[PDB]
Amino acid sequence: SHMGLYELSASNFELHVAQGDHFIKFFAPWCGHAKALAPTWEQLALGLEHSETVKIGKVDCTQHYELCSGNQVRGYPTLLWFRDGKKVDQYKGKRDLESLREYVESQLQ
């Protein structure tokens, strides 16, 4: 990771998400909604950078579009929870740091 934020690719995604809990931002750099989230997502990863039980990731859908499409990502940013290899949630709520952190807490219980 880079200060807690894992860059995921078609080459490493399956290995990465196979065990544990994961919160992953599927994004495109050209999309304003996605770009606006980037600093907050970095803060989220930073606060969790030493944790094993949750890992914060991102997938650039301009580089790995088939991985995005294969996970039914239809627009950016799409924020997905994976647990032990399986997509288990999509987070559609407010994208401030506190809301994201409280969601993470909810999902790790």
Partner: peptide, 7 residues
């Protein structure tokens, strides 16, 4: 909330 750019 939930706003996105379409793929």
């Amino acid at each position: 909330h939930g706003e996105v750019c379409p793929a």
